[PDB]
Amino acid sequence: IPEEISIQERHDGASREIDRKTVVANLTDAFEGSTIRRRKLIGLSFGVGMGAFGLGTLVAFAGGLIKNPWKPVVPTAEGKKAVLWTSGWTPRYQGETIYLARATGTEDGPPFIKMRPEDMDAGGMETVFPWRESDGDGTTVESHHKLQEIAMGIRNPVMLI
């Protein structure tokens, strides 16, 4: 393809005064001809009306997402608490037994089994979860749901040293 050089004649800067004066005259005449400047009541009522409509609409748009983080929804032994203060280690009926179960990685019957103090040496660590024997092994769908919700709780895991 042949080699070439070209020059473009920018023509930058402000417009020619012709166009500026004509367009500003058009805008000013379209505004002054409507006589809206000397109509105070119409303008102010229009403003308040549009403002109220816009405010109500935006509030209704962004109002379905907002939730209260402190409403008591979690049942405990002293009534109901907010989610951000219960843990799953929280007792439910004033004196229930919560074992320190450990994960086995298999799904025949136990995904969680109890522990004894002798199942660990002086240099060991283990992760444990709250058991609540009323949850049972993972056979039925009900117990399977209970266990899969125990396994996924962001404040449940505990290190045993």
Ligand X SMILES: CC(C)=CCC/C(C)=C/CC/C(C)=C\CC/C(C)=C/CC/C(C)=C/CC/C(C)=C/CC/C(C)=C/CC/C(C)=C/CC/C(C)=C/CC1=C(C)C(=O)c2ccccc2C1=O
13-28 burial, b if ≥16 CB within 10 A, otherwise e? eeeeeeeeeeeeeeee
Indicate whether 60 belongs to the interface with ligand 9YF (CB under 6 A): no
Return the number of the residue (122 or 154) whose C-beta is nearest another protein: 154
What single-letter amino acid sits at 67? K
Beta bridge partners of 100: 130
Interaction mask 23-62, ligand X, x per CB under 6 A = ----------------------------------x--xx-
What's the first-to-final CA gap in the chain, in angstroms?
77
Contact 112, 98 (CB under 8 A): no
Q: Which stretches of the chain bind another protein, using CB under 8 A?
A: 1-10, 12-23, 25-30, 33-36, 39, 41-42, 45-46, 48-57, 59-61, 63-69, 83-84, 103, 107, 127, 148, 151-154, 156-157
Q: Which stretches of the chain bind ligand 9YF, using CB under 6 A?
A: 59, 62-64, 66-68, 71
